[PDB]
Amino acid sequence: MFTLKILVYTVVIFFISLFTFGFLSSDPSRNPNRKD
Amino acid sequence: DDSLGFVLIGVTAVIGLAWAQWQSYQDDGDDFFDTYDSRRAAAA
Amino acid sequence: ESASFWEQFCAWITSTENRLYIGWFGCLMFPTLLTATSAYIIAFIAAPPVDIDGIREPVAGSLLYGNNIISGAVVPSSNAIGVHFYPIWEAASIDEWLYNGGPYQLVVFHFFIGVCAYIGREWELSYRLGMRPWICVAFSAPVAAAAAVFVIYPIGQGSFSDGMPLGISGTFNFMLVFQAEHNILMHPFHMLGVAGVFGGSLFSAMHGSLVTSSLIRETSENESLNYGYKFGQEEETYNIVAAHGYFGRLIFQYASFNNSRALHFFLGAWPVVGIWFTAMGVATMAFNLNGFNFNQSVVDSQGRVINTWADILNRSNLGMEVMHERNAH
Amino acid sequence: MEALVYTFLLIGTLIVIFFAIFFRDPPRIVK
Amino acid sequence: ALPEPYTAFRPIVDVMPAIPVLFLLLAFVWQASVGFR
Amino acid sequence: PIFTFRWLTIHALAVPTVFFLGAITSMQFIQR
Amino acid sequence: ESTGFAWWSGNARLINVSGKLLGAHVAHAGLMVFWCGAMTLFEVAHYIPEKPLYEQGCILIPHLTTLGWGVGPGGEVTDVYPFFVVGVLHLISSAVLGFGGVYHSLIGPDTLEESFPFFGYDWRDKNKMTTILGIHLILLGIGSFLLVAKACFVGGLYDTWAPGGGDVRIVTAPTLNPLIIFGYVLKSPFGGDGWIISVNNLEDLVGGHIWLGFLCVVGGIWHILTKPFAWARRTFVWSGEAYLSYSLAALSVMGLTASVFVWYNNTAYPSEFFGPTGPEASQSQAFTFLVRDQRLGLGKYLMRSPSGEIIFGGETMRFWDMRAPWVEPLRGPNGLDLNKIRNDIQPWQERRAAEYMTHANYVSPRSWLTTSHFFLGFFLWVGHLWHAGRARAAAAGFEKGINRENEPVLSMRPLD
Amino acid sequence: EVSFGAFLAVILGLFIPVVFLVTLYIQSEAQGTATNFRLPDKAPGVPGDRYDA
Amino acid sequence: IRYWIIHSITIPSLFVAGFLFVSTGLAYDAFGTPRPNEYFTQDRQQIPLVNDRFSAKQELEDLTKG
Amino acid sequence: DRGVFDLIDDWLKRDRFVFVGWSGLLLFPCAFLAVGGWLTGITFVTSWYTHGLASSFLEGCNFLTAAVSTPANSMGHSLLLLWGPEAQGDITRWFQIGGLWTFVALHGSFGVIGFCLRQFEIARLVGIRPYNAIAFSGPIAVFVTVFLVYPLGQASWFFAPSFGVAAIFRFLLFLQGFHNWTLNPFHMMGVAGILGGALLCAIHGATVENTLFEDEETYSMVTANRFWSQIFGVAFSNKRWLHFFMLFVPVAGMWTSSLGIVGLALNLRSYDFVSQELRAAEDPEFETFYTKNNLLNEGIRSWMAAQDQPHENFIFPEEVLPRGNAL
Amino acid sequence: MTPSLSAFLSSVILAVVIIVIPIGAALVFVSTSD
Ligand code: CLA
Ligand code: CLA
Ligand SMILES: CC1=C(/C=C/C(C)=C/C=C/C(C)=C/C=C/C=C(C)/C=C/C=C(C)/C=C/C2=C(C)CCCC2(C)C)C(C)(C)CCC1
Ligand SMILES: CC1=C(/C=C/C(C)=C/C=C/C(C)=C/C=C/C=C(C)/C=C/C=C(C)/C=C/C2=C(C)CCCC2(C)C)C(C)(C)CCC1
Ligand SMILES: CCCCCCCCCCCCO[C@H]1O[C@H](CO)[C@@H](O[C@H]2O[C@H](CO)[C@@H](O)[C@H](O)[C@H]2O)[C@H](O)[C@H]1O
Ligand SMILES: [Fe+2]
């Protein structure tokens, strides 16, 4: 039961961290009207 | 593992070090005067 | 010199060449919506009955326990839980988790996160394709309605048990109980929502009939007219002036939308604003700000009450209300 | 066997949806 | 229950809440007077 | 003076509307 | 129309015009203060001394009596003169703000960039924008300390949890330990925990305001003296619409939080001027009925919670986490103690619950505040979506539509 | 009480129109008319070229 | 010019005619709408409902009299 | 042209402030009388002698509660003509027995016939296909089935909807309580069409306005197809199929729900699942949301029947009134 | 001739002489005039 909590916590934090660090990876530049 | 901050710290470290490796070759030190930064270094 | 793993990951995530766009919002959307879908399918097919009331009489909602597709539902969480966070690891057994309506909480929370991330993903793809970003604002209205029906009404009522069940007959039961307790039919915001939905259907059928009526001839005698349009063509596929003349002569000439842009803004705006207002009505009735009460509004000279149609509606509400309060006293 | 029929119908609908998404007619832009 | 030396200012008090609303209608009539410029 | 189709149509609406509007106003002063 | 915006989007013409933008903002602030003063005067003009504040549709006066102005023991309203002086002070301050706003909008400088370089700004000047944010953060941190002055030195705050029925209590020992404060901030938002809404004492409130004021003043100093870092510069959009969108998202979060706050919390919104909460009214009905049952000659009214708790049964068992100042003297370690119920019951505790049960066409001011600020919070989230999308698309350069010559989709590979 | 006639109504009410649609599409593929991304008919009975061609 | 002078007389006359159609009680008699003092009578304490189709005219007259 | 018929035809189709046509000879008087009859009823005419209700502005009702109520149940399916054997020329007795309802319904029914003929006439005059007339057949089918076919299968005109806001609200709860109309699959197809039509209106208006060209076609169909293919999985590629679909789904929703109302006229309702009802009878612990709904339908029926049908003189004691306290 | 039958005959006659014939005459007049 605690192991399931561990795995769910790890998965949730992994996906949230993917979202957060992805939007920090110069997201406004990833657009087709980029200057250079 | 009484507190559950080890999962938070550990996973955000692993993805954070991957993001830090990408950030290392970003030549973002110079400041820009624009609405958004168009500079993004690709292929290392 | 070698590109970092994070750069390749960011290039693949925000790639516009994927069959389904993923994006950073999709990094939240896809796992949450997939676990909500899997949990909903499993709980709909096989799940033991949930004691929603608390008086140890459970409600069967799964197909394996004597339900069909119409009557089957994922029953809301138990009244004992209320608005408590109830994951699987907080229950003593899986049997107790299924008995208290935990799958409802799991599916509802993952679905809510998924639809908010769907709004963000719609903005994200609109940004990667270089188009204007207001489709997500249009999708914010059914998301607001789902939020009011699944999260915000349980917050106001203090329990996830009176949230809308994830089923057809459960949806009808929610509607009847909500009408009994709040008189949503006489709420002005539900009137605005019905106006938005009815008008949206009217304007959709009207615009579709107007465009279908004035299609320019490009096909043969009995060939399907849809081959007359080429995907990616520049010229108009229908005669705009003929449709405008028909609509002007149909009611009056000043009401014809001479601009297709203003007409399409009106089409996109009317049901969205209507659904926004009905969502805000449902969420405001959660905090007991009920609809219009026109009960006993007509009396004679001697004080006797002359009923109106609102009194008959109130009688129906009273019948549903006294049947809802199962052994409350 | 009613629940079996219901499950078969729902799974078949999801299979049809999967085929309609991923094995759709590929859109080609006219020249 | 207004204070005693200002009880004669009771009628003007009830219309004080509605002044912010008519400021919004003031913007609409100003544009309508200028011809929606 | 003017008795054309334009005159007959809009007087068929305006004449009962104003009469009904006066009747509605009178109902506001009925003590009930 | 030559600016690109029609009359229905006319305030969008003031994005680059800094002086007129300042005039519009100061005029709107004057309107806010004018409404504040006018509502305070309206509420004191219609105030009936015998009735409680929540029976007269009062929203502004209940906030003022929570700060210890014109209050008595048990929540009695004594003198409406402090409320009157607060309303007239806001009314006088509104005329100053209205005149300054109309001056800066009409006859002031159009763009205060060529003159007054301290007040002139550009939306892309990341150093200048952090300075304004730092100054206003310092001002907000000072304002948070004004509540601390009102709580520890000037008069006191009405402590509804004081024994005997509540009183204006001076706080001398605020909770300065950051573990409790930031555990309140990091608390779960579900039932039982309740995030920051479960602040159940004045000490945690004033200590959290001390910590917030210190954080805001050091953050304001920091934002004045520093510049955005490289990650922040590469992440955000530097334009007026973008900053408006960020503020809209924040304000939407605050609106929803305050709606649920006034719906649930009993400390910052005591049940003597705002009325009982929904759970409070339900448990008041159950408790009063149990009192009548015990007086006129108990498992019929109570039940055994599985967590070792004694709580009221029936439909009100879902509100077992409700904490009230008139239940706690009868609540021991395991919940409702039967001996404490039969013996320690006091006449002040039974009148409150007798009043709350019949005040569950009446709409409570809690319901009005909750519904109105929830409506505003949701629509401000919608406005955040609109302005964030428009700011990002206008910064990238395709907010006016797709270029027919270089269409981005036509240059991509086919999907399948 | 498994209603025997109801089982046939669900089965045959699903099988027969699915069969009719599947048979129509397969002979459409054989004739080269099973796509909407093609030009209108050049001649009676002659389908137009595909957009990719 | 004559547009306004007609509508300065006929329009107030029509509004007045509507006002004195309800305030004089003529609207109650014309449409059969009961006044607030005649919803019930002394000899009739229940709701007066028509129970026969072809005697509906006669039934209403012997029930609304007085 | 040549012949008196041709001058009338030319005058009726002449471009004026409002088109008349030959259909206007039927549409304009019938629609004016139906709307004028409805406005007369909600202002002056009562429902005291038919329903035991006040339903006019004269009696103190507002716009939400005023209605033109249905005739008395004793009238049956009578046409209730002003000169008919019920009113016998008495305009006052005609108003009291509910003759204004049949006036509004019959003139309204010929009004919507004239409007659909008007759609056919202007389409022939302009020269376009008559798809707006086919789309209006949806509202025609809904009006005909609900206001005419449903009372014609029932006992009388009394059980038809009354022309009012709160009166329509009663009709919604009446058909739920007495017919379990929400559980009917034809209403379900109607809800899908009407909610789908509102979805199609919102999603098409947003897509066109958000794929516009900065200024032939005003928006990018290729960009719109690419966006929805990656967001939703499928997307429209044919503009003509997209607009037929915007016609089809709300109109098909009107037509599918009208077929179920015809069944409801003869009480051929989808009230119960028999196997689920039998299993709950033998096993009292069995309970689903469908079984809870049938309990609420019993609560609707018994608690409204005393006042919704006052002609029956229902006297229900408190013992027989269903309650949650007796399960 | 019962009163209902006489009422029906009167209704038919009234419809023809108040609705049909006046509208037709007005249409003929305005069509020959314009
Ligand atoms: C602090 C909040 C704030 C600020 C400073 C702005 C600022 C701006 N907005 Mg943004 N917005 C906000 C909140 C805000 N908005 C919210 C909450 C929403 C969601 C509804 C939006 C959605 C929005 C849209 C869709 C648009 C803007 C636009 C604009 C710009 C033009 C202003 C304008 O059009 O006024 C004009 C004001 C009016 C015409 C009057 C509006 C009154 C409406 C019709 C009724 C509102 C209800 C009101 C309370 C009355 C109710 C009465 C009731 C009793 C019946 C300007 C930059 C425009 C923009 O995008 O271009 C740059 C534009 O098109 N906003
Ligand atoms: C909170 C409300 C508010 C405020 C403060 C502003 C502010 C402003 N607007 Mg906006 N606007 C609003 C709401 C507001 N707007 C709404 C709801 C709409 C939709 C109708 C608009 C549509 C709009 C358009 C289309 C334009 C503006 C423009 C402007 C600016 C120039 C004003 C001007 O030239 O007026 C002149 C007005 C008058 C001469 C008549 C009013 C006279 C004064 C101001 C009345 C003050 C009364 C008050 C009691 C005085 C107290 C003083 C006393 C205390 C001493 C100004 C900064 C313009 C612009 O953006 O830049 C130039 C412009 O073109 N607005
Ligand atoms: C710019 C502009 C605008 C805006 C404006 C504004 C917004 C304004 C504001 C203003 C303001 C906001 C003002 C205020 C005022 C106030 C006043 C003027 C005051 C006075 C006071 C007094 C007089 C008082 C007295 C008293 C006392 C003392 C006691 C009690 C009684 C009494 C109350 C009487 C608009 C939109 C319109 C338009 C465009 C332009
Ligand atoms: C007063 C008081 C209190 C409090 C205190 C405190 C101390 C507070 C604080 C608070 C806090 C401390 C807060 C915080 C917040 C935060 C937030 C809200 C965040 C957000 C974030 C964001 C917004 C971001 C985003 C993003 C991402 C994620 C990615 C990338 C992109 C971006 C950047 C956009 C208490 C309750 C105790 C008591 C009573 C009184
Ligand atoms: C800022 C937006 C906030 C949105 C919150 C929701 C607001 C929309 C709700 C509209 C109906 C609210 O209705 C609530 O207030 C009305 C105030 O007159 C009252 O409703 C009643 O008002 C009058 C008597 O007081 C009478 O006309 C009626 O009996 C009834 O309309 C009731 O107190 C309650 O039914
Ligand atoms: Fe279109």
From TrEMBL, chain C:
Listed transmembrane segments: 21-47, 101-120, 132-156, 192-216, 262-287
Domain of life from the UniProt record: Eukaryota
One term under GO cellular component: chloroplast thylakoid membrane
Residues that, per the record, bind chlorophyll a 1: 88, 110
GO biological process terms on file: photosynthetic electron transport in photosystem II; response to herbicide
Major localisation: membrane
Single GO MF descriptor: metal ion binding
Entry keywords, A to Z: Calcium, Chlorophyll, Chromophore, Electron transport, Herbicide resistance, Iron, Magnesium, Manganese, Membrane, Metal-binding, Oxidoreductase, Photosynthesis, Photosystem II, Transmembrane, Transmembrane helix, Transport
Transmembrane in keyword set: yes
Translocase in keyword set: no
Membrane topology: Multi-pass membrane protein
A family per Pfam: Photo_RC
Binding site for chlorophyll a 2: 190, 278
Binding site for Fe(2+): 207, 264
Family per similarity comment: Belongs to the reaction center PufL/M/PsbA/D family.
Job of this protein: This is one of the two reaction center proteins of photosystem II.
HAMAP family associated with the record: PSII_PsbA_D1
Protein name: Photosystem II protein D1
Protein's organism: Chrysotila carterae (Marine alga)
UniProtKB/TrEMBL annotation, chain D:
Keywords noted in UniProt: Chloroplast, Membrane, Photosynthesis, Photosystem II, Plastid, Thylakoid, Transmembrane, Transmembrane helix
Protein's name in the database: Photosystem II reaction center protein T
InterPro entries: PSII_PsbT, PSII_PsbT_sf
Protein family membership: Belongs to the PsbT family.
Highest rank taxon of the organism: Eukaryota
Main location per the UniProt record: plastid
Residues spanning the membrane: 6-23
Species of provenance: Tisochrysis lutea
Gene responsible for this protein: psbT
PANTHER family named in the record: PHOTOSYSTEM II REACTION CENTER PROTEIN T (PTHR36411:SF2), PTHR36411
TrEMBL record, chain G:
Amino-acid positions noted as binding chlorophyll a 11 in the UniProt annotation, renumbered to this chain: 384, 392
Binding-site positions, chlorophyll a 1: 9, 11, 386-387
Residues passing through the membrane, by range: 21-42, 80-103, 133-158, 210-231, 243-264
Binding site for chlorophyll a 10: 222-223, 229
Key word Transport present: no
Entry's Gene Ontology BP terms: photosynthetic electron transport in photosystem II
UniProt-annotated binding residues for chlorophyll a 6: 63, 373
Name the record gives this protein: Photosystem II CP43 reaction center protein
Organism: Chrysochromulina tobinii
Gene coding for it: psbC
